[PDB]
Design a protein around this nucleic acid. Structure first.
Ligand SMILES: O=C(O)CNC(=O)C(=O)O
Ligand SMILES: [Cl-]
Ligand SMILES: [Fe+3]
Ligand SMILES: [Zn+2]
Ligand SMILES: [Zn+2]
Ligand SMILES: [Zn+2]
Length: 413
DNA sequence: ACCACCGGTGGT
DNA sequence: CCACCGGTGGT
């Protein structure tokens, strides 16, 4: 690993990593995933996706899907997207780039988190501004224009800071990982309890399904316990962000730790909680640099055509829709109605845009640090009653010092 | 190079 | 409100 080519050119074959899983061929991946998940056959679904490196986006630079991978039946339990690396014959020729557990957390818990997080964050949440909230031009209105109701991200836990080259709480006597508006310890305590319990629950699923990435993220658990979430032995997570009707424009999460992954737990509005329902709107998670294969897991063309006809792979067509654009770009540190369309993305077969439609209670695992990814904008974003909430669990780089890096920073001053 | 980032504290 | 801390991938 590796002599297939003299140079691994990642802009040609895609980013190379094996910590979600890797093998000589697709069959080897099924064996790995069958072993990990504890079931065989129909319970596991593998889709081959192809890295094209050409980004699907609207004429305004905002996220679009060209294909949607949807849960095929209630019998399908685990979805894995795999990349067969262009021109490789070695033991890591095929790598796993996304794992989706459809039935991730109990539905009663997912129902409750959706209510409680919506209510808490609408009343007390302080929003976190991120780069990926806007397009390149900084002029789109994908989140909505009503500041009371627009899509938003709320970040909790620990985060890396360039100022300390370590945890942002380096100088905080009593850090509040779950800081809400004002100073209401009781509401923060409730929110902490929800997210800590969820961290605790998701850790063993992470270990089960992506053991190498998991084991990477727990290597320094005992050195930096204050920079970890979770209430039981085994604490891979450090930060968590709640995204409510939030359109994440194409991005990578660049200060996530090397060789780790992100877990996304999805909660949906009450009209999208039944298999085979037709919700009024939905949000998709998109890999803009990939296209779907002409062939299914096992190499059949016909089987892939079956899936396209059944809607297990939804082939989308281009749109031409009215959208808002701000008169001034949003800064660092009025609006007009414009035409937005996706026609150019659909004319080129090699422009990417593979989406998955995560369901209520599902858990998605991907290397967000390395893979370009995005979420689609809602028709009418409303964080007071969101179409989708994502809870995104991660660990940043350089979060391996005790007490949020207090001692190390003191040594510096 | 060079932009822009899932920021918090202490003192006016 | 303000000054104070300044690491890097993508391009
Ligand atoms: O919500 C999702 O599915 C994707 N979220 C992100 O990529 C993010 O918050 O960085
Ligand atoms: Cl990641
Ligand atoms: Fe992301
Ligand atoms: Zn946009
Ligand atoms: Zn090779
Ligand atoms: Zn910390």
């Amino acid at each position: 690993s590796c002599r297939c080519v003299e140079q691994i050119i990642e802009k040609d074959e895609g980013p190379f990593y094996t910590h979600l899983g890797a093998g000589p061929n697709v069959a080897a991946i099924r064996e790995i995933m069958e072993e990990r998940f504890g079931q065989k056959g129909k319970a596991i679904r593998i889709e081959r996706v192809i890295y094209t490196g050409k980004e699907g986006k609207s004429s305004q630079g905002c996220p679009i899907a060209k294909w949607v991978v949807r849960r095929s039946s209630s019998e399908e339990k685990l979805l894995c997207l795999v990349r067969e690396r262009a021109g490789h014959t070695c033991e890591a020729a095929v790598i796993v780039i996304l794992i989706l557990v459809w039935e991730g957390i109990p539905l009663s818990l997912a129902d409750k988190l959706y209510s409680e997080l919506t209510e808490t964050l609408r009343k007390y949440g302080t929003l976190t501004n991120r780069r990926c909230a806007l397009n390149e031009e900084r002029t789109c209105a994908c989140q909505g224009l009503d500041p009371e109701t627009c899509g938003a991200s709320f970040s909790f836990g620990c985060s890396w800071s360039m100022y300390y080259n370590g945890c942002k709480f380096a100088r905080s006597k009593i850090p509040r990982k779950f800081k809400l508006l004002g100073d209401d310890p009781k509401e923060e305590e409730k929110l902490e309890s929800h997210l800590q319990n969820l961290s605790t629950l998701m850790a063993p699923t992470y270990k089960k399904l992506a053991p190498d990435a998991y084991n990477n993220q727990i290597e320094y658990e005992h050195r930096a316990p204050e920079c970890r979430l979770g209430l039981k032995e085994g604490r891979p997570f450090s930060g968590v962000t709640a995204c409510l009707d939030f359109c994440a424009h194409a991005h990578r999460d660049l200060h996530n730790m090397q060789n780790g992954s992100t877990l996304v737990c999805t909660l949906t509005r009450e009209d999208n909680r039944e298999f085979g329902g037709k919700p009024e709107d939905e949000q998709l998670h998109v890999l803009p640099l990939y296209k779907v294969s002409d062939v299914d897991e096992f190499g059949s063309v016909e089987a892939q055509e079956e899936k396209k006809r059944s809607g297990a792979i939804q082939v989308l067509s281009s749109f031409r829709r009215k959208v808002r654009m701000l008169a001034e770009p949003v800064k660092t540190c009025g609006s007009d109605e414009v035409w937005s369309d996706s026609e150019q993305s659909f004319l080129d077969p090699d422009i990417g845009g593979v989406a998955v439609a995560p369901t209520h209670g599902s858990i998605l695992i991907e290397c967000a640090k390395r893979e370009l990814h995005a979420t689609t904008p809602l028709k009418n974003p409303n964080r007071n009653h969101p179409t989708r909430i994502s809870l995104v669990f991660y660990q940043h780089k350089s979060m391996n010092e005790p007490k949020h890096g207090l001692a190390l920073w003191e040594a510096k001053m």
